[PDB]
Amino acid sequence: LEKPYIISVYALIRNEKGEFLLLRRSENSRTNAGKWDLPGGKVNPDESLKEGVAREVWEETGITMVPGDIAGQVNFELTEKKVIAIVFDGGYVVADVKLSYEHIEYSWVSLEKILGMETLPAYFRDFFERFDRENKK
Amino acid sequence: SLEKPYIISVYALIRNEKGEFLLLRRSENSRTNAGKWDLPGGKVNPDESLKEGVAREVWEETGITMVPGDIAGQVNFELTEKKVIAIVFDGGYVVADVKLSYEHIEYSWVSLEKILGMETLPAYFRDFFERFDRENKK
């Protein structure tokens, strides 16, 4: 293959208003620097997807979560790799988010505001449109 | 208050060994200008310098590591939800195999003559290249 595939995992974590946790990436990031993102990241050699998503959520946000069912899939191409990403439902939390070097800020965002963002990357927007459809109808 | 906000963007003029310019065609799922030809570049981030911005955008869109040279000029254009003020940087001459992201579906190395003869490069970029050409040669 001309460009390798990698597996990533993301988590949908909601507050008591049903707003989703988004994180804005640091400027020093090699990919999508400065852009909005879901909690998650690359799966390690030899770990299960659910292990990876809990690990990534804790390191990025301080949240201890037990991953629920799979919410869906998002795929996207970056300059150095193609990403196949599995999204997990992380349920509902009351937590004060605590960031790492990987992110500069966080926001709890409603579904409608997500589908009218623009700095949330297209593949995430598309995912949320799908997720909402699979939920209702 | 302003009815429509302004944003700052940056673009790069990147040439090959032949002096043809790198153009990229935008993906269909883009919120703005979906499917159209564009220069490498994009919106400048909060707290970022223009030259940091253009190098970041060029790397993420094309795989090219560039140190931006002089400013080449300015392009301004209105979109439905914002007005764009864009600064164009000269990225010099490179030997690179372009490697695209989700943002773009194809690329092409296009000469100035064909640029001033194209159709699917937006009018504001056409104008920019017409102005750039006269400020270099004339």
From TrEMBL, chain A:
Entry GO MF terms: hydrolase activity
InterPro entries according to UniProt: Nudix_hydrolase, NUDIX_hydrolase-like_dom_sf, NUDIX_hydrolase_CS, NUDIX_hydrolase_dom
Name of one Pfam family that matches: NUDIX
Coiled-coil regions listed in the entry: none
EC nos: 3.6.1.-
Keyword set, alphabetical order: Hydrolase
Enzyme class at the top of the EC tree: hydrolase
The keyword Ribonucleoprotein is assigned to this record: no
Hydrolase recorded as keyword: yes
Residues of the Nudix hydrolase domain: 4-134
Entry-linked PANTHER family: ADP-RIBOSE PYROPHOSPHATASE (PTHR43736), DIHYDRONEOPTERIN TRIPHOSPHATE DIPHOSPHATASE (PTHR43736:SF1)
Name listed for the protein in its UniProt record: MutT related protein
Lineage of source species: Archaea, Methanobacteriati, Methanobacteriota, Stenosarchaea group, Methanomicrobia
